[PDB]
Amino acid sequence: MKQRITVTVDSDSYQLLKAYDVNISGLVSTTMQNEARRLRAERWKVENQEGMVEVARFIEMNGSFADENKDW
Amino acid sequence: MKQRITVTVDSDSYQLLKAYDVNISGLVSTTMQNEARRLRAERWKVENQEGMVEVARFIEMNGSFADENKDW
DNA sequence: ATATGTATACCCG
DNA sequence: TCGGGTATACATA
C-alpha cells in the first residue's frame, strides 16, 4: 500500500535537499535500503560521476495555519 | 513552527528503517544535509521494457467469371 | 486512479 | 491549532 512517512524537519536539514529538487521520495527510500541493510554507517570512494543537473523545482506546494484556540 | 516532510512511500525500503526502530525523522533530514551539501547529481533510473512484435499473415483472393454475348 | 506532498486532530507536557 | 507521526482529507502533478 502507500505509507506516508513524514519527518517533520525544519531543524535537521530537509529543506535543502528539496530546495534543490528531491523531497526525499527517492532519497529516503534509497538511504533506507542502505541504512536498512547496513543500519549504522558505510564508506566509499571518489564519486567518479559528472554532475550535470539543473534545478527549477516545481511540484511541492502547500501550507497553512489559523490560530483560534490552543487546545484545552 | 516545524516543517512536515513526508515521502508517501512504504515498501521503498522506508518501512525497513523504522521497522527496526527509527521512523527516519533524524536520519532523513540529517542525511539530506549530506546530499544537500554535496549535491553532485541524481542517478537517473533507467527502465528495461522491450518494444518488438511480429506479424505473419496470408489470406487469399478468389474471383468468378462471366459469359455474356450480344444477342443477335 | 495513483503518486506524491502536506495539514491537521490527536497524544502527552 | 503546539509538536513527531500518525490517517485522512486535501492539494497538486
Q: Where are the domains of chain A?
A: 1-72
- CA–CA distance, B58 with B6 (Å, rounded to integer): 58
Q: How far is CA A8 from CA A31, A64, B13, in A?
A: 17, 15, 19
CATH topology for the B9-41 domain: Arc Repressor Mutant (1.10.1220)
CB-proximal positions of chain C, under 7 Å = 3-8, 10, 12-13
- CA–CA distance, A30 with A37 (Å, rounded to integer): 11
Method: NMR
Contact A20, B42 (CB under 8 A): no
Q: What residue type is B67 in one-letter code?
A: D
Cβ-based contacts of A25 with chain B (< 8 Å): 7-9, 12
- CA–CA distance, B37 with B41 (Å, rounded to integer): 12
Q: Å from B68 (CA) to C1 (C1')?
A: 66
Q: How far is CA A25 from CA A39, B9, B26, B71, in A?
A: 19, 7, 16, 89
Helix (H) or strand (E) holding A29: helix A25-37
Helix (H) or strand (E) holding A13: none
Among B7, B19, B34, beta carbon nearest to A28: B7
Judged by C1' against the alpha carbon of A69, the nearest nucleotide is D1
Residues paired with residue B4 on neighbouring β-strands, in sequence order: A8
CA dihedral B39, B6, A19, B24 (to 10 degrees): -40
Q: Give the cell for residue A45.
A: 570512494
Contact A7, B6 (CB under 8 A): yes
Residues paired with residue B7 on neighbouring β-strands, in sequence order: A5
- CA–CA distance, A48 with B72 (Å, rounded to integer): 97
- CA–CA distance, A26 with A14 (Å, rounded to integer): 13
Phi, psi (deg, nearest 5) at residue B18: -70, -25
3-class DSSP string for chain B: CCEEEEEEECCCCHHHHHHHCCCCHHHHHHHHHHHHHHCCCCCCCCCCCCCCCCCCCCCCCCCCCCCCCCCC
CB-proximal positions of chain D, under 7 Å = 1-13
